[PDB]
Each structure stands twice: as structure tokens, then as C-alpha cells.
Amino acid sequence: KETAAAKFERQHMDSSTSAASSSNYCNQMMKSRNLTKDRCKPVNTFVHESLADVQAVCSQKNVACKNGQTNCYQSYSTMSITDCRETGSSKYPNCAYKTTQANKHIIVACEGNPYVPVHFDASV
């Protein structure tokens, strides 16, 4: 099956754009990355940086994850991110999202060898 690392890339990486460019970004991306296949995922974050810069976070500031696990890492620098949140008119299979563009530090959980991001925890 799809690896955790690959799933992280599919769910969270968009190195092809520097920022969301319109209000329809989330609607398009949530669908195209297959995040609405079985149900409307209620929230998701896309990161507009190189994969290498995001992988590098696993060697940055170790912090506790929201759930208490201690394999989380916070980026030293802010990154370009897009937050997608389900709107009131969202109804499967026509999932609908509000797009919010921001520059924040990211917190990811890392696993494996190579040690890479497998979960997006938070932006701060």
C-alpha cells in the first residue's frame, strides 16, 4: 500500500505553487489529491515549499505533538501554507472548502529511516 511518507506528500505538499491564488484552490486540491474520495475530510493544510525543506524539519526543534507524542518537530522558519476548512455548504460528494493563505511555522511528526514527515500536526 501507499507508504506513510508518500501519503504525507499527497495530502500536504504543493511545491508547484508559491501560494493559493484563488478562493477555489482548496476545492480543486482536496479533490485532485483524492482527499474527498470516501468522505469530506474536514480540515487539511498544504505546504508551498520544496519537499527537501519540509523533510529537513525532522532535524529541527523537537516538541511534543498535540496528542502528547514526542516525535514532533517545529520548523525554525515560517513557511507558506494554505489552510482548507470545510464550509457550511459542503455535502458529500460535493465537498466544499474555505481557502486561507498564511505564513506560519509547521509542526510535523517524523518516523522511519530515512527519518521523514508522516503526519501534519499543527501550524503556529
From Swiss-Prot:
* Cysteines engaged in disulfide bonds, as pairs: 26-84, 40-95, 58-110, 65-72
Gene Ontology terms describing biological process: defense response to Gram-positive bacterium
Which residues hold substrate?
A: 7, 10, 41-45, 66, 85
Q: Which residues are glycosylated?
A: 1, 7, 34, 37, 41
Broad class of where this protein is predominantly found? secreted
Q: Which organism is it from?
A: Bos taurus
Give from-to of the shown chain within the full protein: 27 to 150 of 150
| UniProt-recorded name of the protein | Ribonuclease pancreatic
Function in brief: Endonuclease that catalyzes the cleavage of RNA on the 3' side of pyrimidine nucleotides. Acts on single-stranded and double-stranded RNA.
Q: Any idea where this protein resides?
A: Secreted
Keyword hit for Cell membrane: no
Tell me the organism's taxonomic lineage: Eukaryota, Metazoa, Chordata, Craniata, Vertebrata
